[PDB]
Enzyme design. Structure first.
Site, PDB file in Angstrom:
ATOM      1  N   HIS A  44     124.675  72.589  92.980  1.00 29.94           N
ATOM      2  CA  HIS A  44     123.889  71.482  92.445  1.00 29.94           C
ATOM      3  C   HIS A  44     122.626  71.199  93.252  1.00 29.94           C
ATOM      4  CE1 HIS A  44     125.523  68.815  95.639  1.00 29.94           C
ATOM      5  NE2 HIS A  44     124.335  68.272  95.464  1.00 29.94           N
ATOM      6  N   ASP A  93     131.019  73.921  92.638  1.00 30.21           N
ATOM      7  CA  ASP A  93     129.753  73.587  93.269  1.00 30.21           C
ATOM      8  C   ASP A  93     129.574  74.498  94.475  1.00 30.21           C
ATOM      9  OD1 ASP A  93     127.405  72.385  93.836  1.00 30.21           O
ATOM     10  OD2 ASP A  93     128.252  70.469  94.516  1.00 30.21           O
ATOM     11  N   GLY A 186     121.602  64.348 100.807  1.00 36.98           N
ATOM     12  CA  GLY A 186     120.876  65.191 101.741  1.00 36.98           C
ATOM     13  C   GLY A 186     121.800  66.088 102.540  1.00 36.98           C
ATOM     14  N   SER A 188     124.470  67.451 101.130  1.00 37.04           N
ATOM     15  CA  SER A 188     124.990  68.411 100.161  1.00 37.04           C
ATOM     16  C   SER A 188     124.746  69.856 100.572  1.00 37.04           C
ATOM     17  CB  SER A 188     124.353  68.169  98.788  1.00 37.04           C
ATOM     18  OG  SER A 188     124.773  66.929  98.251  1.00 37.04           O
ATOM     19  N   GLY A 189     125.729  70.711 100.306  1.00 35.65           N
ATOM     20  CA  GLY A 189     125.597  72.121 100.628  1.00 35.65           C
ATOM     21  C   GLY A 189     125.954  72.422 102.064  1.00 35.65           C
TER      22      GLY A 189
END
Length: 237
Positions: A44, A93, A186, A188-189
């Site tokens: 995402h 995701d 921020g 995320s990942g």
């Protein structure tokens, strides 16, 4: 990262900051070095991203301030998004970034071990979430990479906290009953690193949550071990 503290430089050598150059350069998401030419991150994170040409991966970074126009970075040759991915809350995701060049490992930048299928029975008691994300739901990207120790919760427990969602075995959650510590916008990942047997394993990928660090709202992460076959398939030329 909410309720965390500043990381020690080189403490999370697999953590990278993924930047977009459009419109102007800024931190987009976190990510993890899992191979010399591979970064594992969240699918995402590429919403609106039409080309990998606008991406830049910076490794060995503690403070965003270290990143200047003259700072070296890794270009992204290909963005690989799981074919079943639709949106963070529905799972899958996960994405791979194939770098244009190889990362030369050093104390400042090295890969994190992928979890083993034989360790899905292991009880990770030393897990940490890291990133330059918000320190508050309504905040901004932080300069110094933050870290927060957060306990894993059973999926049954997680499901009980997200009744409007379906928490699948392909997700894994971490959080405190009373909240206070959690990943945020921020982050995320980014990696959910857990130390087991003196070795760090990439247990999860920061994905989503109901706001940030709220009580009875564990952070939700992509359960990496459920994707080792996918990762092998997608990275094996």
């Amino acid at each position: 990262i909410v309720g965390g503290t500043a990381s020690v430089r080189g403490e999370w050598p697999w953590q990278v900051t993924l930047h977009t150059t459009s419109p102007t350069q800024r931190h987009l998401c976190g990510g993890s070095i899992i191979g010399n030419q591979w970064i594992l991150t969240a699918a995402h994170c590429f919403y609106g991203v039409e080309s990998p040409k606008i991406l830049r991966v910076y490794s060995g970074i503690l403070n965003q301030a270290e990143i200047a126009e003259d700072t070296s970075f890794f270009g992204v040759q290909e963005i690989i998004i799981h074919d079943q991915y639709k949106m963070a809350e529905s799972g899958y995701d996960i994405a791979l970034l194939k770098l244009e060049t190889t990362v030369n490992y050093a104390d400042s930048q090295r890969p994190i071990c992928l979890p083993s299928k034989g360790d899905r029975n292991v009880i990770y008691t030393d897990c940490w979430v890291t990133g330059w994300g918000y320190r508050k739901l309504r905040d901004k990207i932080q300069n110094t990479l933050q870290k927060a120790k957060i306990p894993l919760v059973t999926n049954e427990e997680c499901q009980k906290r997200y009744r409007g969602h379906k928490i699948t075995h392909k997700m894994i959650c971490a959080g405190y009953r009373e909240g206070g510590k959690d990943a945020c916008k921020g982050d995320s990942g980014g990696p959910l690193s857990c130390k087991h047997n003196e070795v760090w394993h990439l247990v999860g990928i920061t994905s989503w949550g109901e706001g940030c660090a709220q009580r009875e709202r564990p952070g939700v992460y992509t359960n990496v071990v459920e994707y080792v076959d996918w990762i092998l398939e997608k990275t094996q030329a």
